[PDB]
Amino acid sequence: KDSPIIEANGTLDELTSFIGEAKHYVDEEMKGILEEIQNDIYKIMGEIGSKGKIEGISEERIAWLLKLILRYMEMVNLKSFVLPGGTLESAKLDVCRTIARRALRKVLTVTREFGIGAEAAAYLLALSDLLFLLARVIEIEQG
Amino acid sequence: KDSPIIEANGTLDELTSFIGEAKHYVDEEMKGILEEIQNDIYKIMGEIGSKGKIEGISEERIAWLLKLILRYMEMVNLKSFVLPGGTLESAKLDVCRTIARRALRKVLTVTREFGIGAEAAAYLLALSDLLFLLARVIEIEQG
Amino acid sequence: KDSPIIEANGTLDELTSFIGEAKHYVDEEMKGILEEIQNDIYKIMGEIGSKGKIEGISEERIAWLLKLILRYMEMVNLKSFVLPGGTLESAKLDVCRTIARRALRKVLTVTREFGIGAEAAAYLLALSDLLFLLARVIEIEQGKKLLEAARAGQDDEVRILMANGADVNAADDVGVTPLHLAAQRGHLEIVEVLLKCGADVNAADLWGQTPLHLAATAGHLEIVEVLLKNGADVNARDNIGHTPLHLAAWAGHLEIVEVLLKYGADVNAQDKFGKTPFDLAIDNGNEDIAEVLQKAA
Amino acid sequence: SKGEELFTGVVPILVELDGDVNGHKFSVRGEGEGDATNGKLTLKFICTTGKLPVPWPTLVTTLVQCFSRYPDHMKRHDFFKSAMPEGYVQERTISFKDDGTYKTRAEVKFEGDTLVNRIELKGIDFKEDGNILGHKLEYNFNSHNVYITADKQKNGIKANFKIRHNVEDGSVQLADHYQQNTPIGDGPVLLPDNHYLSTQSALSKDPNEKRDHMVLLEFVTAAGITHH
Amino acid sequence: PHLVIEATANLRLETSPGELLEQANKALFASGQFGEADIKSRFVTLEAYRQGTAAVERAYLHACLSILDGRDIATRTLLGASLCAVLAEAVAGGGEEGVQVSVEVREMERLSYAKRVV
Amino acid sequence: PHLVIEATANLRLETSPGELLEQANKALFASGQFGEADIKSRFVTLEAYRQGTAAVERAYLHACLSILDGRDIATRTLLGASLCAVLAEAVAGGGEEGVQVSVEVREMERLSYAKRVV
Amino acid sequence: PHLVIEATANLRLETSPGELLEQANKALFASGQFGEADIKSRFVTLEAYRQGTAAVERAYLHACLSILDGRDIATRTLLGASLCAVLAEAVAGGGEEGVQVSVEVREMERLSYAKRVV
């Protein structure tokens, strides 16, 4: 009921909506990844909505993102600053990334007030680093 | 000119933009509904921009949404948590819904400061319950 | 590291993402404009991220936007409040505009705290006035194609353009509606499908004419019957004062005079010259149209 | 035959005038379209050099008689269309009563799909505070008859008529017109029996136009030949 | 909105002094802040002037825009950058070296400002 | 108190430019705020001017009163409303439509203001 | 730094109007605040003017120094006292009694001030 708890749920509900808008433009493999990221954002909304009285995500899940980041970070050959939206499909995943950075700043205020959702904010920080790699893999698969 | 009045108009102008982006993916019947919702959001922006010196929406309009919610709430058979964005069209209306909850939280700060726009914030609360039903009717019409 | 600096970079990074989503729906010209606006938002993020220790944009850039705003502001003829998202393409640029107003309010807090990024916030204020003009130019470009398709007489291409949200009441410089050109050229199904969407039946051009006027003087009976079934003024007057009955008696088509007469045509009327339609029928010497018009009077 | 067929639909029109009256030079450009079958036309003219030194109504007759409605029984008398697309030269002497005179020379011809009227006008001996240079003419126009006769020796035609311009104080300014038309091309043209054109003009303004301008609607019908 | 444009005497303009004011009023009205009839501008040509202590001959141009207060710093900064680009393009040159153009934007007070239409 | 009155060139006044200044100094001294000899006023006639973007011919009058600060908003508002009624009654007319009169009241800063009597 | 010097028509100066400006620019540049080439000054001679309500004939001199803000009150007070001593020594006399010299120092705003060099 506090102001920081209601803003934090409002943005995590706005994040999981763009991911549902953006998973219809990707292929079949990344669509299985983006469906398992929406389930995890629905768990985080319970941990934060109840002020911790419900279990949030386990640490087995933050170890699941880091398996993926190390798998795509090899495919992506890093380069200089490249403007977002190379293709239409990779432009949808660059909108989802910048929402996950705004959700990270809201969940990170709940942590510095109520001491809860520290392992949730570590999930949104690894998430927004994954959505940056999924956006640059699509551009290369088109190249 | 105050900080709460300018934020409240900034989000209601951002809400009525997504509804214009999302009314090209729906059919002809719901398009007549979504065009009459944009006219009503343009009235609310005058009530809040002038700090009440202009008439906002009447109560005849909040009685118009509630006719619709009771009409669709019969078509939609409620179920367990279903992830947003079943189809592409119903994914556009789930982005518009989560903007209307963010506009509700801004208009509701104007109310708890300047005592204005109480019957406006009651329009954005009924609106975001309608956009949730319009999103679940489209999925069923596809099913 | 301060709270106002991190929020300001978070929104400028969210702004330059929507512009990348919205530059795939525009044409090749505006795509060259929207690519040079993304480079400039990437400069502003360096000025604000480093708290000024890096050079931001020059003033040569705020003078570049203002060249564009003065070029499109002539093409766009301003009108009353029109709802965002006329077409699908112009709906994408109205989402980008409302993000640029939210970025302006964040950059403008950094200015009122740290005294930096004053010429950046003047770039985002000129930007959001440019994205409003680029959004209203696209609808117009869509609306001129409806006039061209109405003059071409295309059955399916008019419905294709109408299903994408082009305006039914888009006017030219001479003030003509697509209903005017459709009734003039003689394509009945185009008048039907334009009236089904809600085109204004009694629009006036710069000469004061009406779709019933051109439909009467063009000799197409079906468009007269359809327009009179849908609520056209039977006694509309042009700049001189000719009724549909006046031009109908002038052109020598008897059956359209019968069709005008069935729905209540004024025979007792006059023009600015002073002539009744019976007088213009007598002046030409057609005996039959002088006999039918006088007997019903 | 090949001439009249160019006018069976709606035809785009361009008008261009270069003028000099009492040493005051000006230019007018006009654009619109014509429906010769019905003899109805619409044009909008703009003064491209600022404010006109003469009243718009004095230029109406100078600023395309090929758009006249010639009814079927008079088709053999339509000189104007028969000269197309090569066109004709139209020369006029316009004498304003108790005032100056206009001399005009125009070429009326197709340039591509567009009917073009390109005019040179010279005015002399006008009075400084007369009805013309003093801008005392009402912004309206009366109906007139244009009397045409064949000029066989010149394989062309002549016309005479008198224009009546309403003056703001209720008086009438007469403008006597003499006209001659000769084909531009070397091909044969129709040379008509005596007849006349009945003309009506409606002048208006464009509410969105900031430049000095004239909006014009005109209907033209040929008569003066008994029907059978 | 009052616009006072002060140019030295040796400054050569691309255009006439009267045409410089029409271009400067269209650049202020194109910002959407001001009414159409409320934009009032005036041009003044200096006679006795000095710039700096050096013996170099110089020329300069200056414009002071006075607008009623109640506007944020983003609007005022865009009015200075919009006019400075209109003035700098009307300057052909003058003196022995570069011309300096500058535009100030100051706020009148809204409460004590009286206005009437005769 | 400095009073700068700027009128366009086509503006016709009921009186001469010098008599307009005597009436405007009696209206400032009648407010009891200012000394008698400290009221200094000057009249300037503009040559190159433009109002609005329309081709309509117009005229305007403007006065800027500069007073040392330290006075409340009730005194400053009464000085603008006292002069605007003096100027508006001296304007006969000009241009093709109504004349606009306006009076600004601005505060000089009292600490940094230096004054001497030779 | 803009320096606007406004003298009445009957005021007699020790020097020419052009030499008064060279002395006033050396007194501003000697304060070490301003660049050498950024000191711009102009001299204006009034025609219609009135001081006070009395019939006594008077003359006055006034200078308004506009400097960008961000300077403390000790620097602004020293710029008013440095110029007022330059102007008061150039006044020979005028009118029927003492000449009044005054110098205002006002701050332009630094963010909205645009400057370019053609």
Residue numbers in the entry:
A (entry chain T), B (entry chain S): 23 to 165
C (entry chain R): 23 to 319
D (entry chain A): 2 to 64, 68 to 232
E (entry chain N), F (entry chain O), G (entry chain X): 2 to 119
Task: Reproduce the article's own wording on this structure.
Our scaffolding system uses a DARPin (Designed Ankyrin Repeat Protein) as an adaptor component that is genetically fused by a continuous alpha helical connection to a central core comprised of a designed symmetric protein cage with cubic symmetry (12 orientations in symmetry T). With these ideas put together, our scaffold presents multiple symmetrically disposed copies of an adaptor protein whose sequence can be mutated to bind diverse cargo proteins for imaging.
